[PDB]
Amino acid sequence: SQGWKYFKGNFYYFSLIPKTWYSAEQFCVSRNSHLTSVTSESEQEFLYKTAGGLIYWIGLTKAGMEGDWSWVDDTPFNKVQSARFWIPGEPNNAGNNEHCGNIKAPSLQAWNDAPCDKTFLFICKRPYVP
């Protein structure tokens, strides 16, 4: 694709077609990428500003028996440093059925937990590799 956007060593694809969380991830994997992780304030800002107020699936999903949040691209999840990135009151596990996460609010406090079977646009991430 020519639509990939560049920021700090990584390329990002903002989809034009909505998919479920896992179908989105599979699309990313077919393009040599994963649903995006978020590992700094600057990256969170780039993503929510680029999202322009629309909801995008990101790589947030539950893992292990505790149900701690994790990144599908296998970036270790930093719970301490990620607290600042959830919309206040989230993750709220509405209906006991919200096991995936998206960028929802256009703010540094952007993330929401939503049902994985919901269809949203999505964001892939790919490190530049020469």
Q: Can residue 113 be called a binding residue for Ca ion (CB under 5 A)?
A: yes
Peptide bond into 91 cis (omega under 30): yes
Q: Can residue 17 be called a binding residue for Mg ion (CB under 5 A)?
A: yes
The site map against Mg ion for 81-110 (x = CB under 5 A) is ------------------------------
Closest Cα to residue 10, out of 59, 52, 56?
59
**CB of 73: closest distance to Ca ion in angstroms?**
22
Q: Can residue 54 be called a binding residue for Mg ion (CB under 5 A)?
A: no
Nearer to Mg ion by Cβ, of 30 and 96: the residue is 30
Q: Can residue 32 be called a binding residue for Ca ion (CB under 5 A)?
A: no
Phi, psi (rounded to 5 degrees) for 47: -70, -50
Q: Can residue 25 be called a binding residue for Ca ion (CB under 5 A)?
A: no
Phi, psi (rounded to 5 degrees) for 94: -50, 130
Ranges of beta strands (E only) in 72-120 are 100-103, 111-114
Interacting residues with Ca ion between 64 and 93 (CB under 5 A):
92
Helix (H) / strand (E) containing 123: strand 121-127
The residues of the shown chain that bind Ca ion, judged by CB under 5 A, are 92, 94, 98, 112-113
